[PDB]
Please model this.
Amino acid sequence: PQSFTSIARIGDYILKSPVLSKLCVPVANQFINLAGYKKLGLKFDDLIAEENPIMQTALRRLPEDESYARAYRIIRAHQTELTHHLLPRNEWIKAQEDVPYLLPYILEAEAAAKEKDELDNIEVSK
Amino acid sequence: SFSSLYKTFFKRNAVFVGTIFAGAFVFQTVFDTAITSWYENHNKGKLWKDVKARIAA
Amino acid sequence: YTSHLSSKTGLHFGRLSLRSLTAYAPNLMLWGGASMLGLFVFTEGWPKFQDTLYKKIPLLGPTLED
Amino acid sequence: AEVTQLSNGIVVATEHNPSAHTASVGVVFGSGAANENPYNNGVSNLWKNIFLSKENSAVAAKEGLALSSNISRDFQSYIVSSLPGSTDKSLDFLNQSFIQQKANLLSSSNFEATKKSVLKQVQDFEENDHPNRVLEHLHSTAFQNTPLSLPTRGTLESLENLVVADLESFANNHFLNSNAVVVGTGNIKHEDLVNSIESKNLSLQTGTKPVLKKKAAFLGSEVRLRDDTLPKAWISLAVEGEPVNSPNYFVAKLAAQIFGSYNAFEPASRLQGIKLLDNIQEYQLCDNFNHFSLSYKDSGLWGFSTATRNVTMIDDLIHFTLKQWNRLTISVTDTEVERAKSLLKLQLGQLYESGNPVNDANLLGAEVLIKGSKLSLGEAFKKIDAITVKDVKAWAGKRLWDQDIAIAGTGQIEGLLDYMRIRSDMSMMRW
Amino acid sequence: KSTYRTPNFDDVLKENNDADKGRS
Model:
């Protein structure tokens, strides 16, 4: 387990600088394309572990029209992995369609939980 | 003198367990030696302790 | 106080707080001492362990006789 | 805004306050529903209601002035509110209709109407209400066979056996001049200081209040009324508080503020608070809290009360509250003490400075009879700023470590384990 | 006998003492 606040910090730091961006973004796309979930139908807003309580709240906050699509994607993935085939190369997920919609619903909740868990150990104030 | 001093002595659970264990230790030792003494002197001429002394000459 | 009370945080590993550790420190030490005494009680003394138990208390353990 | 006492036959205390403009002369008696033996329980109630009915009917037609009363344990609080500039009429009426005469008011028809109204009121209080029911039961169970446990209202069996003679005897044995202040809360200054001393403004039967033999006690017991017809549950723990006029009153009150109130149906209460509120919200363990530390001259009680819709998780609520109380005497964060100090300052400021003069009159009478002199809230602030974690630790170790508890809850209580997993768990943690 | 009227427990109550000594 590793919160998305730290991921967001490291990601902004890497991507903002020009030289490290030019040296690191070319390999990230190749890494994703070689990973595998793209063809089998998974969006990265689904592959994350979805059991810990903060992700549970995030899932509880999702609008209907994305939760239903997530349900369809996961059940179809279950089926295709069951049959050992791969999806035909016409209904895959395109490069530009792997947009993160679930990230903000994790960052906001994680920030709230982190900054509430710290608030109990407050001091006398001065 | 069962005033609040003993209640404060019993307030802490950990010292309660420490005291009960120390009492168990001392009780074991003194009780065992007392029982052995009573069992022994209750039989004059029976146990080997004095028999070997008697046979000594 | 006027205006913002300007609170300050405290070291914590999520749940445990440093003040809690300070409060439990004497109790934990004395409970550990009681536990050590209890372990001493449970062991009566071993052939090798008489090397350390004879000198523990001189007014209570003079059982060196045959 | 300074309180002035004296002793000229009858103690007269005044607390000028030019903010409000509803002058309220009053009368307060130091012996109410505790200094009387259980067999005549509702005599104070009968007095209260005959007053509140017939005198209320008479006053408005005579002049313009309301009237109220109160009773808690030893408080024949008895207040006649008025306009700022009509207090002389209030004193004249109070002389001519409360201490003398007591025969024109106590007519047969009026007394019987009061009797039936009181019977109906106590009956439907016993039927409908619940938290006050369990509170009265808590008092009754904590002070068995002590002139402190009989309820403020009474019991129907006790009520039915009263007509005049016992009411008259109580009037002649507790309306003396020894323990009868004349409060003057409102916006009056000195007319109360002089008009209260006149030719005959003096209570009948000058003498002393007959002192009861036994003092008080404490012992744990249950008076549960287990009945499954009612939807919810009710519980009320208790541990012996601190009597008034003791150097532990305010520290006990602080210990009755760390946990604080609660109401699980508010967006502004389910979210703040302390560790127990964090530990309860995961399920619906409870539905209400009410922490309080009641104190009386005989003795005091440090209260607790819930009203839980859930009926199966009662034991977990009880165990968590008991663990919090257990650890209140082992380790308290200094910030918790600070927050308690601030909140308690707010609570006392709100209570003592209510815009309604009647409550201030009541409290002034209470303090002036019990303490002997009012303790100004400023001194309360100065003497509470010095309460340090050492003092709370000492007081909790004295009053909340393996001590008798009294619990008496109506409703559905079968899920509540009876007495050993509700008392012997109150120190189980290895301190 | 009303609900508040507790029965006579004095046949068993430890009226004497009733202090921390019993707990001890």
